[model samples]
Target chain A: STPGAQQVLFRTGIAAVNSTNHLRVYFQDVYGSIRESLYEGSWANGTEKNVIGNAKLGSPVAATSKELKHIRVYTLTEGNTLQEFAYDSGTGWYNGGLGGAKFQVAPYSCIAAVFLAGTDALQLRIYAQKPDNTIQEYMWNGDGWKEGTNLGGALPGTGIGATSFRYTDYNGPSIRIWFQTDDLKLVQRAYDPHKGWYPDLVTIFDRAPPRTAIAATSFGAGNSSIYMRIYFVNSDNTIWQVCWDHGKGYHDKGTITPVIQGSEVAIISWGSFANNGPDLRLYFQNGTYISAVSEWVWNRAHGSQLGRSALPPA
Target chain B: STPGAQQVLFRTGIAAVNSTNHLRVYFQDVYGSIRESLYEGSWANGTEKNVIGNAKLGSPVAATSKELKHIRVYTLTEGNTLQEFAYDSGTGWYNGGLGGAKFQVAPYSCIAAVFLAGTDALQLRIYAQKPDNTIQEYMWNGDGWKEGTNLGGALPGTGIGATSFRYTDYNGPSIRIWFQTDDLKLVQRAYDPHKGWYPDLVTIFDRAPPRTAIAATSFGAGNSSIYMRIYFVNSDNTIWQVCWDHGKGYHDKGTITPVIQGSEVAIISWGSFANNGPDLRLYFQNGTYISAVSEWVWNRAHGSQLGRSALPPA
Candidate 1:
């Protein structure tokens, strides 16, 4: 009885704060069904919450819309099409069909979605990787999801990261998404009410591996000033940061950790736009069993890995 | 045909930011069914959303828990017992039975609730006016709703108002509830992690009309410095503010508007604790057929009313 315990592991789910403010790591469980683990600070203390969809292939990309009072989780179904499961107190979890069944998407595509505050209806900004490797933009224009602004930018990065921030009423809210170029470059796309998608597509750097994942978010330390952060896996298997500050513009912050390769990252930032940044969590799959998850907490200088979740067998 | 449109009116309902960030004004519609109106800036364009339960006796007290991703609306039913209606994506609207079948509330008693961020549990700060004229506390302890802490501070006021602000990991969160005493005194009770309930129910003021409503919220102009505002209808039907600032301590700001009498107020604050304040909305009912809804936007000195909603039939 001294040292016998069955050891098993799971995927590092995408972390988020549910409407009630619970810390949830959403991932595919061993049964191939999407499940979310509720935790305060550690995954070991987490228990799986409700999830839907048979993730026949891809992972989950979700949006917790505070305005709409629902959490919509999207995942790749059998034929590479995305299925939606929405959670609200009124109806619980109901299938919203494929890509809302409004459109067909490429198989196992890198998908990202965000809930933006709009007038009276539910509004969403969606980006999905198509078969040709370019990213297609879908806008939830109140009545329906409209798509037409397909761009030839993305090159099949390992992952896609997106986040939006609230602006003035006149200016409307702004959004940005990040991706890794097929040639191992980090690309950034911008959109706002004043100038749709401007500055074209800008590459932050070219040191990332073609298969590297990307996580992006907009942080503000004050009202008038904003900052953008991009985390990517480099060719050397190290985590890197390309960040922008109020006036300093864009600059690379170098490597974070050298142990993570071909892993996904989720950025959860608290406080106001003018407040502090987020703690980066990297979930790297070691095998079908034990996946390595580490959190990097930043202070004044370099961030440190505090609570790493998994390790190899003894 | 130019000027022959039939006019309509609605009670100024409680305003909230739904999980999706929509501006919702929830009120008992003409049919006595609690309804929410979705509006951007004015009530003219606001459309009613889904709501359940018939308001047999009293108005509604609700909580839009982003963590729970659900909105729970409570009201006084036929027997003066409170009933709960919960909304989530999983289930649309389900009756939760008599809110506290174990406990019964007073006829037309005021109620208050707030969704506070806690551990991995759904935490709620609930307060209702008991028949004994005291306030009974009902806490959602994650698993079940529990009640026992009955206070003698409330002796029949216009409304019971409550709000909470998150502190830190070590300090947890703090909440404060405001009530108007039977003798026309404004009472404020404080609670924090370190203290169960402190200062022994202090009176913020002593001039509120027994029938006037109460609306209270915690505001922070800076992270470390916080403020509490208690809006009560004074004896002369004027709105008065009992507020606490960082260094200024507690003071009474008088006469927001002289026209509001026995009206309901909803305080919706934006930004962080270290940020600005909220707009003051006064919805005064004029005969069940018309309600006077006016918003006083605070800038620096005396506030001014601009976008008035409904008025007495022209």
Candidate 2:
């Protein structure tokens, strides 16, 4: 059965453009319409605005690029087609979808997209799972849409997480796509200019409970190094992590902390004031009004550590 | 249905030794046996030779080393034990598997192995999924095969992707194991000198589609900096990518191009020109005689670009 419009799938993200970043949250409400909250400051205490009052979608994802100043938001309609909405500085928010070429998507499939700075234009690539569990991709190579390609697999569910980065050692840029199947196994696919698609599926777990949500963020060391951290809500409703450093292979950070049962998780990395190093913040719905969040700080001068932030004052 | 011996899965790769590189390809053919093709020179017009005509296995994976001029191949036999075949300058091709010990393997598990450079000799570590989905590891520490240790996970399917890299940031070498479960989630486990095995399963995606193939490559900005790129075929038949730089977080660069439907994807990276910069090549069967291939050239002096190549006549 499909979720009611009144339900928020708990999809949210932080978009950075220029030097400022904004928090964007989307959910469906009982009013048979999708509603959005665009927050304007620190996520903990940002001014919220009711941006879109009637978006028809299952779940939504949003991104802002360093090369592009506008925020692009994507969602799947009940018909399984992709719909795009964008916020531009000049015209504010408007529809950005190509109505003539509606992209087909899987039911409840997670959506991930990124902007690549190319020689001529900013390239856009959108990824989603097919109904049969395969991944389908749509791309704008600074010119037009080149849709239709099936990256094979029989994945189930909608736990899609994605990220991109560049390394001095790599020939070019790269991307990573992650998801969980109905059986709860976590899998990943990676790509770079040197290698197109890897020859095998990389598995993180053999036996694990089904997951409800997953998110990722990375701390840059420069062109030569990068560290990645992935967060997901285990079936047990606990926040689990998979992290990687240049010197360390992927390691399971175990349970970060017990969260409210049935909560979905989202994570982001930033440089906090007290510590001019990488810091991670996790956000998840504690079930209602305000979402619960936590932070981890990584300071070479000091030591890496994690701490809980008190829920923002109601 | 599993691929029969007559079918070319179209999985191929490159191995480096001293200053020379070799193209190594493995596939299941009609005879219910594995066949290997080894090529010398540039992969585009490399010399090809039938290396292994009859290998009894479900699937195949291979790895090589810079310190040693040898190529090691691994697969699973009917009884679910590890089998190894290798090629060296002196011995040519021989069985490298531990004949008596015969490390056990999981049913239809994907194999991931790497040569760990040691103080004296090169070490080898092979990881496989058990019937139960937990990971089982077999290692050769320069001296002998220390067959033991079960990295537990309830993984399903044969989507194991693994890679090793050295970074000045941490204690020592790092190994990461990735795979997808029957349900289609991406999970990972990492190993390094500082910590033997990461404590938990890092979930990349809570719900990812099944992947057809995974390949990984690493670049060294001297030993102090390392960058890695992982590639895979999304069930949709597109070339998807994931990459990480020493200073950059993980990045997802969606689809590179459309590929043969249901064909497995493979990739390799190396320096072809005199400058010794980086280069990447992608290959996949077009469902027939020859395979489709593409290349990306990296120029530190200029920029990186992707271009297509014509298949060698006949």
Candidate 3:
């Protein structure tokens, strides 16, 4: 009787996870663009056709890579409803001490920004402070604004098959960035300065998606781990997760939750992923806030069901 | 129409007017000590003193008639904050029939059933029918419970210097009632059918000290037209409103505005008054929610000047 104990335990809840998955893009074209009389956009337009159209910008290019040069940050506040500030500076500007010393250029690098639905609305920032104490902010608020560095200059190695990765933060208020390069994957840099910002290499999808969207949030303490959801249309015209974390950080749990089953709305908006609850899930197209059905895996009590009622009328 | 004939029209606010008017409490009964009990402190006591207090078996005695009863209505809400329900069974005890019929009891006539404050929350009950051809649902948040009813069955005559009025929205989102009563002077009703409650009111110091508390709300539409307030002490020394309207309705324009020294913290609880922007004058100390201020008075813009800069935070 002592040797024949039999029991199977079932668990249900949104997997407890960390959110540090990231993707980085650095603008290129150093020597020639500095002397060009034409606008940076003209140069970028010229390159989009040939120069860095299909290149992946992961890892480093030149020893003193441009990846570290033009960066920005933003933050949200007021019950997480107000968009307070954004950070970014376009090409044609001196450091003004804004760009750190790593990749400072005679002129700023061209930049391209897009707010892919589901990955854009979470509270985040992309601005840097100059040595002179001046500050600049930029954001991809539902609208398309052309103000910062161009996208092509950063990834000159691989063909332009990768766009930007959704910025996700799960695993406790930290920031996680993702991008598409030679292939789609999740990389992260915990914003904790003491720990430093080195891309925590995490490769999710070996296949490349020209356009990818992501959403993330920190559900626990510590920043090394993250929880993220990425959606991209495969070369086959089918849309699904290129890379995702159902459990903690980047370990493959071999399980994925499909939110869009080919219904009414297509491609969830990045803004719908804002932090209004415990886990980051797609905001329902019906304006109803919804968490992932499998995300409820975090709770062993509700077996695969995201059970909870909407907030009562105020 | 002529320029010379029209010297600047005297459009000074209520604040600019000579201010000497004030509200006084002629009656008040907070139900402090146990005056006289029909039942002795100890049940073992000899005989009984039904002779002592006015427990409503006989009340509101007439000055000329040896045998007379004076019934008054009282108001209570969860906690008397910036709001109060308008009506309850407040001592009126008059038999209101199923279809809304009024009845009077003769012989063992009930007296002024001192409608004292009940230590409980208030609630609304709808006895009306819904579309299902059945009685509508009924729920009590228990935030405001109306316990004491039919105050000492309508005492003797048709008039006993007492009147009651509470805000009412014959049709409201949720049924609600806030009322005030007066054994003397003024009584008003302020109700907002939408919110299903009374909002504010005023007080006029025509009566002396020790009056019943007053309450109010925006009962009808398009800005309340009447004004009201209450003051005065009861023979029981319980400091009650001689005018229930002070807590039930808006105070009618009277002579009690100029002398008010408003408080910084709007005392929405007790001893409050509304202000009239037209005359820029404020009416204060009118018993609870009642104010002597004008319906047109602009408190924020004009009347606050005459008020004190600080007050006790409730």
lDDT of each: 0.55, 0.53, 0.22
| After superposition, candidate 2 runs with Cα above 4 Å error | A1-314, B1-22, B32-39, B42-49, B117-120, B168-171, B221-224, B271-276, B286-314
Error of 3 at A249 (Å): 5.0
lDDT by residue for model 2 over A16-133, one digit each (tens)? 2223234444444322244444335543322123444343322444443543355666666646577676766678777775334677665445676666532235566777876566
Name the candidate, 1 or 2, with the larger lDDT value. Answer: 1
Per-residue lDDT, model 1, residue A304, is: 63
Please give, as one word, the docking class of candidate 2: incorrect
Q: Between candidates 2 and 3, which one is better according to DockQ?
A: 2
lDDT of residue A99 for candidate 1: 59
Clashes of each: 40, 99, 178
Which tens-of-lDDT digit does each residue in A171-275 have in candidate 3? 222333444332333333333334433445455556532222222332322224334444433333223443333444454423233232111101111112224
* Ranking, DockQ, top scorer first: 2, 1, 3
CA lDDT, candidate 3, residue A110: 14
Docking class of 1: incorrect
At residue A259, what lDDT does model 1 achieve? 38
